[PDB]
Amino acid sequence: FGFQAEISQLLDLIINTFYSNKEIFLRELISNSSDALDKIRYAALTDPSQLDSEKDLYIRIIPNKEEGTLTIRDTGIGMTKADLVNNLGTIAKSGTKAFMEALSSGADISMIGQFGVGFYSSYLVAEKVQVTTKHNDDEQYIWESAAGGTFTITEDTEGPRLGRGTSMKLFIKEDLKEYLEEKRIREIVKKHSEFISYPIQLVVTKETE
Ligand SMILES: COc1cccc(-c2cc(Nc3cc(O)cc(O)c3C(=O)N3Cc4ccccc4C3)n(C)n2)c1
Numbered sequence: 001f002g003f004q005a006e007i008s009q010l011l012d013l014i015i016n017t018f019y020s021n022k023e024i025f026l027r028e029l030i031s032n033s034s035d036a037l038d039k040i041r042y043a044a045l046t047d048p049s050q051l052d053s054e055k056d057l058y059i060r061i062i063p064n065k066e067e068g069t070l071t072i073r074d075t076g077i078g079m080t081k082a083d084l085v086n087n088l089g090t091i092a093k094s095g096t097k098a099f100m101e102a103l104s105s106g107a108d109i110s111m112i113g114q115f116g117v118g119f120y121s122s123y124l125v126a127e128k129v130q131v132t133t134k135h136n137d138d139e140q141y142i143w144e145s146a147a148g149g150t151f152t153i154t155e156d157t158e159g160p161r162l163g164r165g166t167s168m169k170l171f172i173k174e175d176l177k178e179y180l181e182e183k184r185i186r187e188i189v190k191k192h193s194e195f196i197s198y199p200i201q202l203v204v205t206k207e208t209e
Pocket residue numbers: 028029030032033035036037039074076077078079087088091092095116117118119133165166168
């Protein structure tokens with residue numbers, strides 16, 4: 001069995017209980033994006049053609065107040081279906097074990113990505129996440145995540161093409177729409193992501209009124 005319903009319920013409950021500073025979700029997403037960007041930058045050293053699917057390496061944040069969503073897209077190396085399968089099965093089970101053993105030992109759990117389950121820190125602010133990903137060696141896939149969900153990985157033949165990389169669309173919880181506001185987003189990136197050595201872009205939209 002996969003146990004994704006059980007694992008996502010547990011992590012949703014544990015993460016929201018013990019991390020009262022919800023804004024670190026954006027630190028974990030940018031840090032995962034940065035890691036994936038390092039991977040394609042390195043692969044392109046020996047094979048320049050790896051960048052033919054997308055020449056620019058960046059992270060872009062796209063709020064949408066009408067949809068209630070925050071989207072973080074990068075042009076990193078992306079994930080094959082094998083990669084996403086490995087994350088949903090092997091990594092989720094093992095990292096959950098390490099995460100809550102560190103919880104239970106009173107260890108310092110502030111850097112949650114350390115345990116490989118940094119993805120689920122999205123649950124601090126989001127009630128569901130849609131993962132789109134494209135790796136040079138596979139097709140574009142989409143997978144939906146929610147606390148208790150058992151959605152299947154599906155070939156994305158309807159969404160916009162990524163070229164290469166990963167796009168995380170977070171459906172923001174009702175009482176937390178503050179994380180869709182420009183000034184709040186910019187504050188959070190400045191505070192938690194000074195170390196990042198790729199461009200971080202934010203899409204702002206003119207208001208009417
Ligand atoms: C552990 O349970 C789960 C359950 C479901 C998904 C994941 C999961 C999915 C990723 N992946 C990415 C997340 C992002 O927010 C942004 C990204 O760009 C990626 C990505 O595509 N990466 C490829 C790659 C290659 C080398 C090193 C790092 C990375 C990250 N993570 C880091 N966790 C984990």
